[PDB]
């Protein structure tokens, strides 16, 4: 499909986040590579203003679906790489269940041959010892499902999605994502029919790191279109 050659192999990932939630700013770097053919991200992340003022969780989904394995049968329904190398602009409205928002804007593109993503990320009223602002939520992740439609208008996509963040006293706090992507340059010729990509997600720690980090291993792939 159109812009699939340029994810052969293993390409080089590069993330920078920076943001501001209830006013406390904080930046996010984040390294590794990824392997679109197998579906497969690997990404150390760690905060470079110290210590994070949210949960390592709640940044994941803000932290290149142009790395997911599409079938055989669904490669023109792939967006993300279809708008490759110029790349895209991603944009997030996350509403914490009975809690806060996250703002996001990121720019997913290449730059020589490394896939970068900058994101400016702006957190609005979460609520003291809440989930968030508490640091209540364990530090795991849920496989989930993201919905992909057509967005005729802007010439790209929409999804949707609830991330469901397990929390230290056995309940869930769930986070309801709204998301359009448009292409910077050229995007597909069509654009996709409805489908999703189903996302697995594996958090870790590096021994040898003293800096807040997350060390994360990611597998997404798409379905929803059935072979004919």
């Given at each position: ?32 590579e990824g392997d679109a053919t197998n579906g497969k991200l690997t990404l150390k992340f760690i905060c470079t203003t110290g210590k994070l003022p949210v949960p390592w969780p709640t940044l994941v989904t803000t932290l290149v679906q142009c ?162």
């Amino acid at each position: 499909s159109k812009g699939e050659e340029l994810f052969t192999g293993v390409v080089p990932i590069l993330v920078e986040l920076d943001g501001d939630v209830n006013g406390h700013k904080f930046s996010v770097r984040g390294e590794g590579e990824g392997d679109a053919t197998n579906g497969k991200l690997t990404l150390k992340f760690i905060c470079t203003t110290g210590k994070l003022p949210v949960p390592w969780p709640t940044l994941v989904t803000t932290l290149v679906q142009c790395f997911s394995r599409y079938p055989d049968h669904m490669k023109r329904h792939d967006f993300f790489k279809s708008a490759m190398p110029e790349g895209y602009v991603q944009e997030r409205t996350i509403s914490f269940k009975d809690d806060g928002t996250y703002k996001t804007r990121a720019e997913v593109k290449f730059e020589g041959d490394t896939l970068v993503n900058r994101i400016e990320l702006k957190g609005i009223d979460f609520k003291e010892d809440g989930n968030i602002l508490g640091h209540k939520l364990e530090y795991n992740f849920n496989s989930h499902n993201v919905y992909i439609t057509a967005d005729k208008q802007k010439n790209g996509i929409k999804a949707n999605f609830k991330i469901r963040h397990n929390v230290e006293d056995g309940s869930v706090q769930l986070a309801d994502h709204y998301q359009q992507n448009t292409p910077i340059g050229d995007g597909p010729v069509l654009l996709p029919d409805n489908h999703y990509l189903s996302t697995q997600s594996v958090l870790s720690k590096d021994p040898n790191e003293k800096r807040d980090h997350m060390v994360l291993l990611e597998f997404v792939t798409a379905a929803g279109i059935t072979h004919g």
